[PDB]
Amino acid sequence: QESVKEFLAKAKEDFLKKWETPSQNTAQLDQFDRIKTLGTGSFGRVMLVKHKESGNHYAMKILDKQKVVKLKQIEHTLNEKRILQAVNFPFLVKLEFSFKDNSNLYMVMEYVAGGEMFSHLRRIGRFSEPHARFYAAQIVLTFEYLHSLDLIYRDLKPENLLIDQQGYIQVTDFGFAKRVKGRTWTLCGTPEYLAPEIILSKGYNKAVDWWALGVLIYEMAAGYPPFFADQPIQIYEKIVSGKVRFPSHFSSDLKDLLRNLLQVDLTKRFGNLKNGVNDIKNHKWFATTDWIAIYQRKVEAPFIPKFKGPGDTSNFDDYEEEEIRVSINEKCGKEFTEF
Numbered sequence: 001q002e003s004v005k006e007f008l009a010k011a012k013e014d015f016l017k018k019w020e021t022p023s024q025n026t027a028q029l030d031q032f033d034r035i036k037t038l039g040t041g042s043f044g045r046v047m048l049v050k051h052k053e054s055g056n057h058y059a060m061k062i063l064d065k066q067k068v069v070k071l072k073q074i075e076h077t078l079n080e081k082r083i084l085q086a087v088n089f090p091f092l093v094k095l096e097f098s099f100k101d102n103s104n105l106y107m108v109m110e111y112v113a114g115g116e117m118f119s120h121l122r123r124i125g126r127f128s129e130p131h132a133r134f135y136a137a138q139i140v141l142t143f144e145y146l147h148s149l150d151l152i153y154r155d156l157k158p159e160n161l162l163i164d165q166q167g168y169i170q171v172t173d174f175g176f177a178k179r180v181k182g183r184t185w186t187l188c189g190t191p192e193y194l195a196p197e198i199i200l201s202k203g204y205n206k207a208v209d210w211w212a213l214g215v216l217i218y219e220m221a222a223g224y225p226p227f228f229a230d231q232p233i234q235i236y237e238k239i240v241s242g243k244v245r246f247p248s249h250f251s252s253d254l255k256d257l258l259r260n261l262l263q264v265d266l267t268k269r270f271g272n273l274k275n276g277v278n279d280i281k282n283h284k285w286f287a288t289t290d291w292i293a294i295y296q297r298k299v300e301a302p303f304i305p306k307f308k309g310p311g312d313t314s315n316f317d318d319y320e321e322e323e324i325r326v327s328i329n330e331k332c333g334k335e336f337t338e339f
């Protein structure tokens, strides 16, 4: 615990430095052969890309300046990169290069062949308490890191965790994220995983991450999410209500932990109370976990996804690909002077 501090202490330092003065550009579209599409979103897509001279594959995040600005997400967009190249953490994706053009914003990160966990999760059906424990183990440290730097992630779901080659998850998508002190008020998020602070609209905080951890662990472990309904509106009724019904197969330690994570009252809710992180980290259910060995990836992962070779893409769903257009006359080049 003399241990914990220092680490972060410095941890912070890095961060701010690389947040004050961050790198502009550092590559150009055409040094990469585009291979296939990994995911989509409202204004871009990720793509497997192979480094022209240095075979290294990478995932490349390409955003349509226009579609963006075309709906103030401008702020979000820049944060994403901002943060992304600022942080450093074994469970955080590595941003390899960023650059822009007359049309798009680009982010080329590391390629984690394992794919998403949404898959794995849905493929296997449910995770053994241990398997779950292992993951959770890692989210926790990350948040503990994330919240150190006044960051509140806000976008915790299975689709945002990539199963590295080694069984270790990797968090991606800092879009929704935000760096603040005190409460924030934006309704960012996916029903199934929203603290109730948010819903009721009051001014949430880092807390909201821990609760998501509950629904995550819960989900990772029951095969479904705690609060689930057909229409977002019915889900709000329960989230908010706190009607958590656990499946018999839940250890009791486990069932205990959620009792807390899924604590509708933030002054009661874990990760938030006086001893903070320590409450969770401690709580029995984590007895077996050697935090340090994990943070350093010593542990033998429950599961290691199969990977055929350099560039393998099996673990990712199939998307309809379209070529990358790069207009011949800069677009909204003002609005993205910082990126």
Ligand SMILES: O=C(N[C@@H]1CNCCC[C@H]1OC(=O)c1cc(O)c(C(=O)c2c(O)cccc2C(=O)O)c(O)c1)c1ccc(O)cc1
Pocket: 038, 039, 040, 041, 042, 043, 044, 045, 046, 058, 059, 063, 073, 076, 077, 080, 093, 109, 110, 111, 112, 159, 160, 162, 172, 173, 175, 176
């Ligand atoms: O994150 C990946 N794929 C992501 C997975 N997460 C959840 C859903 C699938 C997919 O989504 C995207 O590719 C993606 C596409 C987008 O257009 C955007 C955005 O445009 C976007 C944004 O960039 C910032 C804020 C909001 C959005 C948005 O789409 O609403 C995004 O954040 C993710 C991924 C990351 C690294 C890697 O080596 C392999 C894959």
